[PDB]
Design a protein around this ligand. Structure first.
Ligand SMILES: O=C(O)c1cccc(OCc2ccccc2)c1OCc1ccccc1
Length: 134
């Protein structure tokens, strides 16, 4: 259906801004922040029918989610939170909400020029992570 075509591919992190403060807001402890902040993940996005798969491969952790838009699922995040996630498309932006322990964070993924831009928000704190084609 050509849903999410422009996201599909293999992407490499090239910049991160304010990720330490985002992780602090999420509740990540010191050692995980330091090590996770160093990581330069490879994000691999694929689509098969209605199922979107996003993998993240790095020195810190290899993670993978598969999902159908609008349909809640279980995700264990790289920092080991057990969250309930729902991902939708809003005007061409993938919007991913994670719920756990009465908390919530929202991750947006957008195509901007030749980049895939990831915006991570926890209360008033945003981090921006920019990926390029690998
Ligand atoms: O860049 C991504 O694709 C990404 C998208 C949404 C949330 C993420 O981190 C959540 C998070 C919250 C709290 C702690 C770590 C990660 C992400 O980094 C994963 C990551 C980061 C570092 C190392 C490996 C993988």
């Amino acid at each position: 259906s050509h849903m999410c075509d422009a996201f599909v591919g293999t992407w490499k992190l090239v910049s991160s801004e304010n990720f330490d403060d985002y992780m602090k807001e999420v509740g990540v402890g010191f050692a995980t922040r330091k090590v996770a902040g160093m990581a330069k993940p490879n994000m691999i996005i694929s689509v098969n029918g209605d199922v979107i798969t996003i993998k993240s491969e790095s020195t810190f952790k290899n993670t993978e989610i598969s999902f159908i838009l609008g349909q809640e699922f279980d995700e264990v995040t790289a920092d080991d939170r057990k969250v309930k996630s729902t991902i939708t498309l809003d005007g061409g932006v993938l919007v991913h909400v994670q719920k756990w322990d009465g908390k919530s964070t929202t991750i947006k993924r957008k195509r901007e020029d030749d980049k895939l831009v990831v915006e991570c928000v926890m209360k008033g704190v945003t981090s921006t992570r920019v990926y390029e084609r690998a």
